[PDB]
Design an enzyme around this catalytic site. Structure first.
Site: not given
Ligand code: VO4
Length: 282
Positions: A216-217
């Site tokens: 994830h970002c």
């Protein structure tokens, strides 16, 4: 011809059509809806495909690109941390790759809890964070590594390796060279951890839904998708899988925004070109 501007324009055209088709309607049966009371989506326009959703209260999706199996998610909300940790533990996560920078996490207006660099207790789950190695990726970009030990009564204790790109250039795309180095690090970290589970005879090795890298970002559609594309190109099993295939697969399995920026698609195209991998189908 195969990597010329005409081919690239055609790729973009096909992908744009797909994004439009996959745009969420009000109460869209294709997308996860809150179940309910708490905010589910960090961004209202960035939704979680229902049929591939990992948990009913997370914006997180199982993704398979060719043969490569991962989970892509948004940065968990504060209210989602216990569920997020349970996801990580149940998945026997061989690597968690966080591509949100330290600057982004430190911005309290963004509501991104510092959940992997600090220890804490979240409902029934206690988490211990430990610092491990640091690996340079090129261009001064640094991956800081951690282990997260996740404990909960009635559950087997799980340790998760974390790769955090703390100084990710959150205004701009990282180069193909940095992306390659990151994909290699994430893959290697996952291989080492998966091997440990195999050596212990874990039942998770035979389960399609488990042992998936989690990436994830902030939104889990941009930097996240660029990394997933690079990881699938690293996979010995994915010969002849096109860039069109990769991106269409990410989009149908998460949402139409996967590979959010043209800058990110450029990197995937460059990586594919380096391998003689096709951009388009047919
Ligand atoms: O619950 V296991 O780590 O024996 O698959």
């Amino acid at each position: 011809s195969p990597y010329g501007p005409e081919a690239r324009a055609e790729l973009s055209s096909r992908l744009t059509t797909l994004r439009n088709t996959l745009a969420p309607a009000t109460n869209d049966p294709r997308y996860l809806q809150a179940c309910g009371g708490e905010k589910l989506n960090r961004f209202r326009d960035i939704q979680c495909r229902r049929q591939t959703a990992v948990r009913a209260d997370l914006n997180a999706n199982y993704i398979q690109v060719g043969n490569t199996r991962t989970i892509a998610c948004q940065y968990p909300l504060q209210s989602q941390l216990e569920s997020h940790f349970r996801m990580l533990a149940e998945n026997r996560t061989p690597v968690l790759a966080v591509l949100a920078s330290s600057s982004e996490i430190a911005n309290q207006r963004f509501g991104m809890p510092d959940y992997f660099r600090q220890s804490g207790t979240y409902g029934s789950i206690t988490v211990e964070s430990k610092m491990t190695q640091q690996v340079g990726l090129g261009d001064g970009i640094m991956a800081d590594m951690y282990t997260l030990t996740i404990r909960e009564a009635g559950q087997k204790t799980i340790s998760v390796p974390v790769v955090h790109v703390g100084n990710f250039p959150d205004q701009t795309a990282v180069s193909s060279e940095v992306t390659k180095a990151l994909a290699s690090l994430v893959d290697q970290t996952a291989e080492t951890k998966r091997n440990m589970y195999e050596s212990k005879g874990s039942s998770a090795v035979a389960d399609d839904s488990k042992l998936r890298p989690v990436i994830h970002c902030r939104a889990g559609v941009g930097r996240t998708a660029q990394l997933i594309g690079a990881m699938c190109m690293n996979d010995s099993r994915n010969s002849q899988l096109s860039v069109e295939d990769m991106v269409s697969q990410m989009r149908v399995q998460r949402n139409g925004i996967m590979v959010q920026k043209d800058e990110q698609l450029d990197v995937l195209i460059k990586l594919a070109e380096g391998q003689g991998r096709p951009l388009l189908n047919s």
